[PDB]
Symmetry: C3
Subunit: 116 residues, 3 copies
């Protein structure tokens, strides 16, 4: 009956759990400068937060994927994304263009998942 | 306790169901080139997925509506949207501008709904 | 087993409740023209809708924050946002750039929360 939080700072919590649902903050890349690397890094951060929250990649319910330049980077995003997903178990998905908080960030992904 | 999926490909599932919730992938138009036609087509695709997932238009919980050109197309979007909705039963809604994966796509809508 | 609605018009309901979840429509500012004022006003509108829906600021699960100009206004948004949040209880959050329905709107925030 109470939300619980993982990795809280003054602006956000990396994850909020409520009953059987896990809400992740939008994840941004690490040090990669290129789209492939950055997508890999975002997805790695998501996989770790899912684990910490009692979920897993197979239990993702929805992902919204924000690309700084969707025309330029959609193909690379899809390549890395499809490799990362568990086979036959893709979530619902929406991919749109949006500038992110820093101009060097090319990709940000926000996930909602089911706790196990 | 397990998500189920409808129309899964290598990138996404058109719908993911979990308990009493239905998460739809962002729906894009069919063959229409114009905003009115494209909005009608997106909403038709949503109505079919709601049916397949055990929901209905009256049970939509939230919609995020992405317009390639919000200044240009907000009025047309609203015309078609309000016609399509069941009377007195509009969902929560957010409408923002975002380029979609192809430049010819003017509108994309992502819905979360309650299973019946 | 049925969604309930708060403040329904022909396009949207300000809030939709379903079981223990509250889905708010994207909230836009009041009369403020500046980013600080507009953010304060959006957050005030959210706090009122949370109250009406049986929730509260401490029970927010996720927020998506849309900025017309993320480079310009991210710092001001964060200042007001962090002041408004209950201490140690920040939600999951995603902040991206998107033009809103009127050019004078600088900020719009969409919240999902847990009913108490």
């Amino acid at each position: 009956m109470e939300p619980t939080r993982i990795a809280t700072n003054d602006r956000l919590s990396a994850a909020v759990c409520f009953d059987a649902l896990v809400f992740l903050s939008g994840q941004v890349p690490g040090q990669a400068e290129d789209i492939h690397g950055q997508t890999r890094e975002v997805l790695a951060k998501i996989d770790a937060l899912l684990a910490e929250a009692g979920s897993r990649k197979e239990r993702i319910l929805s992902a919204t994927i924000y690309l700084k330049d969707i025309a330029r980077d959609f193909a690379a995003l899809n390549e890395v994304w499809t490799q990362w997903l568990p086979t036959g178990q893709a979530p619902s998905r929406t991919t749109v263009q949006a500038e992110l908080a820093r101009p060097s960030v090319l990709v940000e992904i926000t996930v909602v998942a089911a706790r196990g």
